[PDB]
Write a protein that binds this ligand. Structure first.
Ligand SMILES: Cc1cc2nc3c(=O)[nH]c(=O)nc-3n(C[C@H](O)[C@H](O)[C@H](O)COP(=O)(O)O)c2cc1C
Ligand SMILES: COc1ccc(Nc2ccc(Oc3ccccc3)cc2)c(C(=O)O)c1
Ligand SMILES: CCCCCCCCCC[N+](C)(C)[O-]
Ligand SMILES: O=C(O)c1cc(=O)[nH]c(=O)[nH]1
Length: 367
């Protein structure tokens, strides 16, 4: 069934799977299989070249699974087995909520893209907290061994107080996380991205950071802000300013886009939702570049958006990312894409005269 092998997955297994299952069903199955550890052998051995020290942690490799794949913290261990250097779970909302009605995920095969409007379907903080607690010491050892865990926090659709939603997330899941993500960037919850402008963003993040600072040292995560690729130059300037003013630990750049770039071919291109995958790639990379420059290279960036190769990863790294994430590439190429990206990244680093990933971070800005 599953042997096992970049070409077999890309050319045969995944196309067949996608012919049989709609994207959300495939997503549910992928989560189930991953949680059981039913995966092809991750042959790739991580070299010292790929190791990154950032956010107060060691990362065995700079390739993570983006938020949204494991929304409820169900497959964390299987994701490490897949070869990810770090795992981000979420977004998690304070209370459980169902998200949007189905269908709410759409493939754009011709574009190597996906559009989703899940709408923060979440088991909620309490369920995710107990799920994480069940493996807390296991995670502590994984983190020690260079495999950190991120938790992405959302807010409920019907919440009257957005900042309090995030504050609850910090208090409940913060003690279980190496880093937290304040997701102010979903396409798919009304109002949400408006948390990205200035005086209100400052208010929100001050509250978040205060809650984080009130956790015991051993349970005190880094706090990152995940931003949209659709921000105005003014928005980006404002975010960079608040980030530096408040001492936000890092940025995740970017979420999905509500733009529909010219050239999309998929029949479903005009579905409502965030677009991910290849058509997002360079928009994300350019946002990384801008944010790195606006923060003077002093604020760690996790680069995400259309990464499916070593070149994609390195471009983001050279643009200013210390780490990268992918999601959409996994949906088309399956688990072997993780080793592929890592292998290609290591080769490109050597070819371009970099001693390791760390040496390449922001290299474009020094040209
Ligand atoms: C199906 C789907 C669900 C997602 N859910 C979340 C989410 O819950 N929280 C979040 O911060 N990002 C979410 N994302 C955005 C991804 O984390 C990532 O930022 C974006 O997809 C770009 O990366 P990619 O092109 O590699 O997929 C989701 C993306 C997709 C494809
Ligand atoms: C919207 O969110 C997703 C998530 C996973 C997907 N697919 C997928 C990802 C990993 C898989 O993992 C495997 C592959 C082969 C053997 C065992 C597990 C399988 C399907 C898809 C899709 O098919 O469109 C969509
Ligand atoms: C998730 C869709 C099914 C794809 C085929 C499953 C691959 C099983 C992996 C094989 N094995 C677990 C032994 O390595
Ligand atoms: O749950 C979702 O709809 C969602 C959240 C998010 O942050 N990004 C995204 O593309 N979808």
């Amino acid at each position: 069934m599953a042997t096992g092998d970049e070409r077999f997955y890309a050319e045969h297994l995944m196309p067949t799977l996608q012919g049989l299952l709609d994207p959300e069903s495939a997503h549910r199955l992928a989560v189930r299989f991953t949680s059981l550890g039913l995966l092809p052998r991750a042959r790739f051995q991580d070299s010292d070249m790929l190791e990154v020290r950032v956010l107060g942690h060691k990362f065995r490799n700079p390739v993570g699974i983006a938020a949204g794949f494991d929304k409820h913290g169900e497959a964390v261990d299987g994701l490490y087995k897949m070869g990810f250097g770090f795992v981000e779970i979420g977004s998690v909302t304070p209370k459980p909520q169902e998200g949007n009605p189905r269908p709410r995920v759409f493939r754009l095969p011709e574009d190597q893209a996906v559009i989703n409007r899940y709408g923060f379907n979440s088991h909620g903080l309490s369920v995710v907290e107990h799920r994480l607690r069940a493996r807390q010491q296991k995670q502590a050892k994984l983190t020690e061994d260079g495999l950190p865990l991120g938790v992405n926090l959302g807010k409920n659709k019907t919440s009257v107080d957005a900042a309090e939603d995030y504050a609850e997330g910090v208090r409940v899941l913060g003690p279980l996380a190496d880093y937290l993500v304040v997701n102010v960037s979903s396409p798919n919850t009304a109002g949400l991205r408006s948390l990205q402008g200035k005086a209100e963003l400052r208010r929100l993040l001050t509250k978040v950071l205060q809650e984080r600072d009130g956790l015991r040292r051993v349970h005190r995560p880094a706090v990152l802000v995940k931003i949209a690729p659709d921000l105005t130059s003014q928005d980006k300037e404002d975010i960079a300013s608040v980030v530096k003013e408040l001492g936000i630990d890092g940025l995740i750049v970017t979420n999905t886009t509500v733009s529909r770039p010219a050239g999309l071919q998929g029949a479903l291109r005009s579905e409502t939702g965030g677009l991910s995958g290849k058509p997002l790639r360079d928009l994300s990379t350019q946002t990384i570049r801008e944010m790195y420059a606006l923060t003077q290279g002093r604020v760690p960036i996790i680069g995400v958006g259309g990464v499916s190769s070593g070149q994609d990863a390195l471009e983001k790294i050279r643009a200013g990312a210390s780490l990268v994430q992918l999601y959409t590439a996994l949906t088309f190429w399956g688990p072997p894409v993780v080793g592929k990206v890592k292998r290609e990244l290591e080769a490109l680093l050597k070819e371009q005269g970099f001693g390791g990933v760390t040496d390449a971070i922001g290299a474009d800005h020094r040209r």
